[PDB]
Amino acid sequence: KNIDGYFKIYSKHTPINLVRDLPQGFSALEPLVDLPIGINITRFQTLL
Amino acid sequence: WNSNNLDSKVGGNYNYLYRLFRKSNLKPFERDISTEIYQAGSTPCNGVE
């Protein structure tokens, strides 16, 4: 997320045995650290 | 504060400019460093002034 230039990262690990059709289970996401840069972001791209 | 010897040059000042005619209004908490030409009706200039 990007609110007032602050970068929020919510990461969480959970075990699961499935390839598709994600189950209806519930699990929260907790943050780890705040990154207050203060810039604007409009595009993104993942690395493989 | 007022500057009498910091930015007051004899040969004018060309490093500082202000937007006056562009239609794009700068919203708060934003920044735009695009240097283009204002378009009046037809003939979009955008640098072909």
Phi, psi angle pair for A2, to nearest 5°: -145, 95
CA atoms within 13 A on the CB side of A39: 5
Query: In sequence order, what DSSP letters do the residues of B1-49 get, joined into one string?
Result: ---SSSS--TT---S-----S-S----TT-----------SSS--TT--
Method of structure determination? cryo-EM
Q: At a CB cut-off of 8 Å and minimum separation 6, what does B22 contact?
A: B36, B38
Report the run of H or E that residue A11 belongs to, with start and end. strand A6-11
C-alpha span between B39 and B49 (Å, rounded): 9
Q: Which residues of A touch B30 (CB under 8 A)?
A: 40
Do the chains contact at A5 and B29, CB–CB below 8 Å? yes
Amino acid, res. A5: G
Resolution of the coordinates, Å: 4.8
C-alpha span between B23 and B41 (Å, rounded): 12
Distance of CA B9 to the CA centre of its chain: 19
Q: Do B21 and B38 contact (CB within 8 A), yes or no?
A: yes
Q: At a CB cut-off of 8 Å and minimum separation 6, what does B39 contact?
A: B23, B45, B46
Q: Which residues of B touch A4 (CB under 8 A)?
A: 29
Q: At a CB cut-off of 8 Å and minimum separation 6, what does B17 contact?
A: none
